[PDB]
Amino acid sequence: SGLVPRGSHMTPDFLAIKVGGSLFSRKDEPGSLDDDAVTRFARNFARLAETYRGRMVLISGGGAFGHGAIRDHDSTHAFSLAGLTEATFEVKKRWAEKLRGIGVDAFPLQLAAMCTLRNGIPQLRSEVLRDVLDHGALPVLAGDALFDEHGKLWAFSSDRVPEVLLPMVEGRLRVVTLTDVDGIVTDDTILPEVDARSPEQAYAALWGSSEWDATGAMHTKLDALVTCARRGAECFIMRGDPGSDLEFLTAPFSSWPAHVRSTRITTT
Amino acid sequence: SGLVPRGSHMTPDFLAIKVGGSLFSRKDEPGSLDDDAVTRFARNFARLAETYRGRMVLISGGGAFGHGAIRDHDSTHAFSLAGLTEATFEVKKRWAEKLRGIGVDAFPLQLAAMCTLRNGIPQLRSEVLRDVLDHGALPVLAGDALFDEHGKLWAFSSDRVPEVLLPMVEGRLRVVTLTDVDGIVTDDTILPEVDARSPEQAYAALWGSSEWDATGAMHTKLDALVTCARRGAECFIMRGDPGSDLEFLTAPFSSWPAHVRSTRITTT
Numbered sequence: 116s117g118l119v120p121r122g123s124h125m126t127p128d129f130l131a132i133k134v135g136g137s138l139f140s141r142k143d144e145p146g147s148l149d150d151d152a153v154t155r156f157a158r159n160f161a162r163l164a165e166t167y168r169g170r171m172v173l174i175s176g177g178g179a180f181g182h183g184a185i186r187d188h189d190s191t192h193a194f195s196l197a198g199l200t201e202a203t204f205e206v207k208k209r210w211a212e213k214l215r216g217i218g219v220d221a222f223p224l225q226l227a228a229m230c231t232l233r234n235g236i237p238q239l240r241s242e243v244l245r246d247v248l249d250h251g252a253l254p255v256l257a258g259d260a261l262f263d264e265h266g267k268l269w270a271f272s273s274d275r276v277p278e279v280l281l282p283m284v285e286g287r288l289r290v291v292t293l294t295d296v297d298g299i300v301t302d303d304t305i306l307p308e309v310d311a312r313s314p315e316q317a318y319a320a321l322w323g324s325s326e327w328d329a330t331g332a333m334h335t336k337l338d339a340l341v342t343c344a345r346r347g348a349e350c351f352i353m354r355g356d357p358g359s360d361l362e363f364l365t366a367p368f369s370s371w372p373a374h375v376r377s378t379r380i381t382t383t
Numbered sequence: 384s385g386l387v388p389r390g391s392h393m394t395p396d397f398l399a400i401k402v403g404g405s406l407f408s409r410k411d412e413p414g415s416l417d418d419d420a421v422t423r424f425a426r427n428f429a430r431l432a433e434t435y436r437g438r439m440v441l442i443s444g445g446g447a448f449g450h451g452a453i454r455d456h457d458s459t460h461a462f463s464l465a466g467l468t469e470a471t472f473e474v475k476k477r478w479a480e481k482l483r484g485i486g487v488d489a490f491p492l493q494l495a496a497m498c499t500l501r502n503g504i505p506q507l508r509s510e511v512l513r514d515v516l517d518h519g520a521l522p523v524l525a526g527d528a529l530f531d532e533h534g535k536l537w538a539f540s541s542d543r544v545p546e547v548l549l550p551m552v553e554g555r556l557r558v559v560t561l562t563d564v565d566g567i568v569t570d571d572t573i574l575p576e577v578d579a580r581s582p583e584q585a586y587a588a589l590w591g592s593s594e595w596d597a598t599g600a601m602h603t604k605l606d607a608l609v610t611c612a613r614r615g616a617e618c619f620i621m622r623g624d625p626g627s628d629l630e631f632l633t634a635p636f637s638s639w640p641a642h643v644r645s646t647r648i649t650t651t
């Protein structure tokens with residue numbers, strides 16, 4: 116409804132943290148979950164969750180489950196994808212279950228029950244997300260199989276979940292996507308800043324996976340964050356490490372500790 | 384929006400079928416699921432689902448999972464109940480997974496992501512249910528842990544899920560609750576008909592469980608169906624049997640086969 120001050124000096128009002136599947140699950144290993152990694156990440160997320168109570172969502176990568184359930188679905192019945200919803204709910208559960216164990220009010224929410232696709236733009240269609248946050252709880256979210264306006268299912272990566280927050284979050288949204296690289300690498304060298312109004316050089320730098328990636332690797336990652344940033348968010352691609360202290364993610368970007376490697380995406 | 388003809392001669396426009404946990408899961412046995420029973424029920428539900436495409440929901444009892452996750456939760460943190468949502472999602476998955484296997488477009492939906500409690504009346508708060516049905520799909524639903532307006536979680540039985548349909552379904556709603564008795568037994572003898580405007584004798588007949596029931600056994604069953612029936616639904620309590628042919632549930636109650644035992648609840 117109003118003028119929002121934004122800048123490297125300002126403190127974010129909302130944290131959307133997305134953790135890559137690959138950081139806790141081996142894609143090509145059915146059912147796999149590094150519990151040690153989950154435990155230790157969960158412990159760092161929980162400290163953030165207490166600071167940002169009702170002002171945070173944790174978004175989980177699909178790992179073996181999500182990439183698995185897309186791999187296997189028959190392409191000739193769009194509806195076989197429905198397995199993906201059951202698959203990514205499994206990962207939300209693991210996080211919530213773990214986070215509650217160390218005192219976080221973590222509640223898993225099924226995105227497919229809350230959000231549809233309407234001309235390719237994901238539409239929040241449930242008031243429950245806003246309510247859970249208002250209650251001071253921590254929504255644990257993930258990618259999903261989403262219905263479009265014609266009833267066809269589409270695989271929707273956890274990377275794009277933050278886009279769903281855009282029309283909902285008042286004030287400063289920060290999106291941090293924890294990944295298995297330090298940021299977008301160009302040339303042996305990571306790009307520190309990307310202007311979301313002209314991300315040309317960032318898109319120019321991406322390479323193709325070894326064919327193993329159902330949700331578009333870095334390209335979908337950049338699409339999502341470029342989309343959020345054009346809508347005001349401060350967005351980051353950085354390496355997730357299960358033991359890494361993340362308290363600085365509550366801090367103005369100006370006052371971030373030394374030698375943190377990231378790619379930041381903003382609409383100057 | 385208009386005048387709806389209703390009667391024992393008329394054909395229902397919408398089927399809400401609720402199957403008791405006890406019919407496929409042993410409450411006091413953690414994780415248990417009678418696969419044979421699920422397979423065979425699923426097969427009978429699927430024939431209904433094809434007839435009532437986009438005009439049906441399957442509602443699953445919680446069984447070992449749901450009754451288990453309530454049993455175990457610490458009562459002093461209301462938020463421990465969050466386990467119940469992960470628990471009843473497990474059962475929805477099993478049904479959907481099975482139903483899709485024999486060609487049904489079955490999609491599990493998390494009620495807690497769609498519905499809150501507001502002065503004790505469950506409120507549908509997501510447009511997704513209506514949309515999934517409009518797409519011709521079969522929502523697989525269940526009880527859940529639901530947030531109230533103050534942020535406290537409450538255990539919400541599958542038995543009350545039909546109440547959520549009431550403001551949504553145009554025309555004639557039929558609710559069939561498949562259970563482990565033939566109907567409400569009074570006196571050695573089952574009550575054939577209950578007027579939802581004065582259910583006194585029906586409520587008078589209920590006995591207390593052996594203390595083993597977290598969601599109120601027959602009392603919650605009657606509450607839910609009395610609530611639906613006061614709002615126009617035709618409602619039934621009858622014995623679920625996994626091999627029982629259920630094609631007659633699409634038929635006017637007048638033209639139901641011989642010797643079917645049920646208790647019918649209507650607002651004359």
Ligand SMILES: Nc1ncnc2c1ncn2[C@@H]1O[C@H](COP(=O)(O)OP(=O)(O)NP(=O)(O)O)[C@@H](O)[C@H]1O
Nearest residue numbers: 135136137294295296298299300320321322332333
């Ligand atoms: N210019 C680039 N800089 C960095 N990484 C890149 C670049 N281009 C492509 N990539 C690939 O993008 C990957 C990051 O996306 P991705 O593999 O999807 O990570 P994730 O989503 O965090 N985990 P998962 O989804 O389970 O694979 C890297 O591992 C690189 O292979």
Ligand SMILES: Nc1ncnc2c1ncn2[C@@H]1O[C@H](COP(=O)(O)OP(=O)(O)NP(=O)(O)O)[C@@H](O)[C@H]1O
Nearest residue numbers: 403404405562563564566567568588589590600601
């Ligand atoms: N007057 C009555 N007539 C029939 N059953 C009754 C009556 N009063 C109490 N009951 C109990 O109500 C039970 C039915 O509810 P319930 O045990 O909750 O069935 P369910 O919901 O279908 N399966 P589950 O929820 O897993 O136990 C019966 O098994 C009876 O013990």
Ligand SMILES: C[C@@H]1O[C@@H]1P(=O)(O)O
Nearest residue numbers: 177181258272273330
């Ligand atoms: C939705 C499928 O799991 C993948 P992602 O969300 O990890 O991209």
Ligand SMILES: C[C@@H]1O[C@@H]1P(=O)(O)O
Nearest residue numbers: 445449526540541598
């Ligand atoms: C919600 C808890 O599982 C029970 P019910 O839904 O089977 O009553």
Ligand SMILES: [Mg+2]
Nearest residue numbers: 330331332333
């Ligand atoms: Mg990825």
Ligand SMILES: [Mg+2]
Nearest residue numbers: 598599600601
């Ligand atoms: Mg019961």
